[PDB]
Point group: D2
Chain length 193, copies 4
C-alpha cells in the first residue's frame, strides 16, 4: 500500500501534465512498459534517488507522488496507557537535563507530539537553551515549580511557574526549563503541534 | 487598527481585481470619495451587512478584507497562572457534568483551546455524549480513573483510563466521559487544536 | 447572509472557548440578551470595530467569525461573454500603459483574476515596473511581440517573447511589459491565481 | 538532492518524536549506525517501501520526509517558446478529440498546468465527457466557437461560447468541448491551477 498509493498518484500526475507511458519513459530513459509497471503496483523497489528523478521529470515532488501516512485510529480514537510510554533520556553537555515520556501520537496528526517531561536540574544558572523548534508548543506545569527561560540565551526573559501554570511558546522561539532554584525537580506536560 | 487593516486590505483587493474608486463606488452605490475614505481609515463604522456587500462586489469574503487576529505574545510566549483561569460550569440535562478550567490561549493559535476539565459524574450509564466537534483533541488523565465513550451514542465504544492515560479524539467524533463507576470523580487535561 | 453566517460562527466560537452568553457579554460590556440576539441573526448592524473587538475577545479574527464569500457558480461553472467584460485604463507617470479586460471571476476562487491586457507602449527604455504582487501569475502572449522585464527595476533581466510564448512569474517579483520596440502594441492574457 | 533533503528531514523528525538513533533503528530492524548513515545523506538507495515503513514508524508520511520539488525559476521567472511546447494527442473511443499543447510549468507551482487545446471534433451529440478532475480550471476560447458541456453526462448543461469567452470550472466537475456544430474545429486555452 506504500507501493499502491504511488501506483495511482503516479498515474494521476502523468495524466495531469498530459503525458503517456511512452512520453514519460522517454524523459526518464525507461521502457514504456517499465512505467506501466509502476502504475500497476510494481513501483515498490524504486530507490529514493530514482523517485527524486521521477518527481523531477513530472515537475512535482516525491511527496506529491506518495500516499499520506495511513490512518491508525479505532473509530476516531487512540489510547495509550501509562506503562507503554516511550522513554528518552535527554542529556545536554553530559548533563541529565530532561527525560521524555512520550505520550500518544497519531498518523492523522503527524505534528501532534504530546510529552510528559521530567525536568531534572534545579539550577537556573545552568539552564540549557535549544535553538527553538518548528511548531507551537503548549506547556502545563504538572508538578513542582518550573523556572522557564526564553528568547536570547545571553540575555533571556524569565518566569517562575507554579504547579498548574500554562504556557504557549511560538514556534522557533528558544527556551529552557529547570526546577525552581534548589527545589530539586519539576514535571511538565509539553504538547507540540 | 481593526479599521486600518481594512483600509489596506480593501485597497489591495480593489486594485487586485483592477478597479478604481469610481468603478467600485458604482457597484456599491456610493460616491467615489466615500470609498477613498474607507481606504484611508474611516471604514470603522461600516456595518456587518455593509461589509457583506463590499466583500460581495469585490467577489471575495469579509474575512479576506479584514486583518488577522493581532499578536498577543511577549517575545513568543504567554503565561497564565492557576488562579486566573476562566471557569465555566457545564450542565447537561440539568446535571453538573463537567467544569471547564480554561487554560492559556493565544490569538497566534486561535484553534488552541487548552482545558482542565473536572469530570463530576461517576455513573457511566448516564454519560452524555456531545455531537462531536471540529478540531482534533488530545486528552490526558490528570487524576482519578476516567470512563470514556466515543462513536454512536446508542452502541458506543468504551475505555477505562487510569491516571496518566493519554488519548486522541479525531474531529467530529462524538464522545463522553465520567469518573470510573462509583469512584466519585476524575480530572482531565483536554487540548483542542 | 453575513448576519446569519456570523450568527452561526459566533455561537460556535463562544462554545469553543467555553464561554456562555454571560461570560462573553461581560468582556464586551454588553448584556447576555444582546449576545444571544447576535447569535440569533440580529448582528447585522454591528460596526467593523465592534466586530474587531468581539473577535479579539474571542481570541480570534473577524474572518473566522464571518461566512465564506459564497457560491456564484452554475452547477460548477461560471461563464462570461467578450462584450460583458470590465475595463480599466492603467496609467503610470501620466501615460496609458495598459488596458485591463477583466475575464471571468468567482467567489469560489477569489484569488483567481484572469485578464486580457493590452500592452499600449512600445518603448522598452520607458518600461514601468510594478512592485511585484501577491500570488503567482501565468501569462500568454496573445498578439504582437512582447518585451518583458522582471526583477530589479534598476537592473532587470529581459526577454523578447513571440506570440504564443508562455511565462510564469512567482509572487512579489516585480515585472513590466511593452510591445517589442517600435512594434506599436502587443497583447497578453494574464492569470493571477 | 533527494538523499540530502531526506537526510535533513529524517533527522528533524526523529528528534521531533524524541527518538535517538538506537530507538528508531530498533523499530526498523536496523542498526543505529545505519540510521546515522541515512541522516548523513547515505539513504539514496532506500526503496519506496522501506521509506514507507520508516515514515510509518515515525508516525508520518513519506512526503514529510522528502524535499520540495525544487526551484527551476530564473530570478522568479520561467519562459517557454511556442516551438518548444510538448504535445499529446487525446483520443476517446478511438477518435482524436483534443491535441494538448503544453505551456510553461514549474516546480514552484506543480498544480499549475496551462495548455492550448485544439478541439478537434465539431459534433456536440458525440461529445466525450471527462470525469471531472482535481483542481479548478480557467478557460479562454482562443479561436472558433466552442460548444461546452458540463455536469451530468447523461443530462449536461450547455453553452455556445464565442471567441473571447472565459469560463471557470470548479474541481471534480465533469465537462466536454467540441467546436460549434459543423464549424469543424475550435481552440481553447485551459489553465489548471
Ligand atoms: C519542554 C520542552 O519543550 C523543552 P525542549 O524539548 O523543546 O528543549
Ligand atoms: C473532555 C471534553 O472534550 C469533553 P466535551 O467538551 O468535548 O464534550
Ligand atoms: C501583465 C500584468 O501582470 C502587469 P501588472 O498588472 O502586474 O503590473
Ligand atoms: C479543456 C480540457 O480541460 C478538457 P479535459 O482535459 O479536462 O478533459
Amino acid at each position: 500500500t506504500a507501493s499502491t498509493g504511488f501506483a495511482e498518484l503516479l498515474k494521476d500526475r502523468r495524466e495531469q501534465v498530459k503525458m503517456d507511458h511512452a512520453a514519460l519513459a522517454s524523459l526518464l530513459g525507461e521502457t514504456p512498459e517499465t512505467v506501466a509497471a509502476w502504475e500497476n503496483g510494481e513501483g515498490g523497489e524504486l530507490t529514493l534517488t530514482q523517485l527524486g528523478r521521477i518527481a523531477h521529470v513530472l515537475g512535482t515532488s516525491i511527496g506529491a507522488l506518495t500516499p499520506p501516512a495511513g490512518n491508525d485510529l479505532d473509530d476516531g480514537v487512540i489510547i495509550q496507557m501509562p506503562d507503554e510510554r516511550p522513554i528518552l533520556k535527554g542529556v545536554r553537555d553530559n548533563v541529565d537535563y530532561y527525560v521524555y515520556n512520550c505520550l500518544v501520537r497519531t498518523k492523522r496528526a503527524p505534528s501532534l507530539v504530546p510529552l510528559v517531561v521530567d525536568v531534572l536540574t534545579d539550577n537556573p544558572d545552568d539552564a540549557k537553551f535549544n535553538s527553538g523548534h518548528a511548531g507551537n508548543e503548549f506547556l502545563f506545569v504538572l508538578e513542582g515549580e518550573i523556572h522557564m527561560k526564553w528568547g536570547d540565551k545571553e540575555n533571556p526573559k524569565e518566569a517562575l511557574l507554579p504547579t498548574g501554570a500554562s504556557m504557549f511558546v511560538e514556534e522557533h522561539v528558544p527556551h529552557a526549563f529547570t526546577a525552581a532554584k534548589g527545589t530539586g525537580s519539576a514535571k511538565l506536560i509539553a504538547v507540540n503541534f
